[PDB]
C-alpha cells in the first residue's frame, strides 16, 4: 500500500534530521567561546557541509526506492503520478529541515562571534 511506503520513507527522513541535529547540538554544548574552538569551526563547518551532502544523497536514494515500489503497484499511471508528487513533497520537506539545521548553526556562530 501507498501509505506504508510513504510512512516508511518519512520515518527514514526523520531519522536523518534527528541524527544531524544530534551532531550539531553536541558540538554547541562542547563549544566554549575561546580561540582553539574558534579556529576549528572552519573545519567543522566544512565537515558539516559534507554531512549534509551525504544525507541529501541518502534522501535521493531512499526516494528513488520508494518511487520504484510505487511504480510496481497495481494502480493507474495517474495514481502513480499523484503518489510520486507526494514523495516529491516529502523530499522537499526533509531538504528544508536539513538545510535549516545547517543555516541555523552557521547563524549561531556568526552571532556568537559579533
- The domain in which residue 19 lies consists of 1-114
Q: Name the resolution in angstroms.
A: 2.0
Q: Give me the CATH number covering residue 46.
A: 1.10.132.20
Domain count for the chain, please give it.
1
Asked whether 87 and 9 are in contact (CB, 8 A), the reply is: yes
Which technique was the structure solved with, according to the deposited record?
A: X-ray
**Contacts of 109 by beta carbon, 8 Å cutoff, 6+ apart:** 41, 45
CA nearest 24: which of 55, 69, 61?
Answer: 55
Question: Which whole-number Å values give the CA distances from 26 to 1, 23, 75, in the listed order?
Answer: 38, 5, 46
Cell 531519522 belongs to 15
Amino acid at each position: 500500500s501507498m501509505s506504508d511506503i510513504r510512512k516508511d520513507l518519512e520515518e527514514r527522513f526523520d531519522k536523518l534530521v534527528e541524527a544531524l541535529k544530534n551532531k550539531v547540538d553536541k558540538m554547541k554544548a562542547a563549544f566554549r567561546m575561546d580561540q582553539f574552538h574558534e579556529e576549528r569551526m572552519k573545519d567543522w563547518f566544512k565537515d558539516l557541509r559534507k554531512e549534509v551532502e551525504q544525507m541529501r544523497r541518502a534522501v535521493r536514494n531512499y526516494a528513488s526506492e520508494a518511487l520504484s515500489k510505487i511504480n510496481d503497484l497495481p494502480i493507474t499511471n495517474d495514481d502513480k503520478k499523484l503518489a510520486s508528487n507526494d514523495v516529491l513533497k516529502l523530499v522537499a520537506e526533509v531538504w528544508k529541515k536539513l538545510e535549516a539545521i545547517l543555516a541555523d548553526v552557521e547563524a549561531w556562530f556568526t552571532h556568537h562571534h559579533h
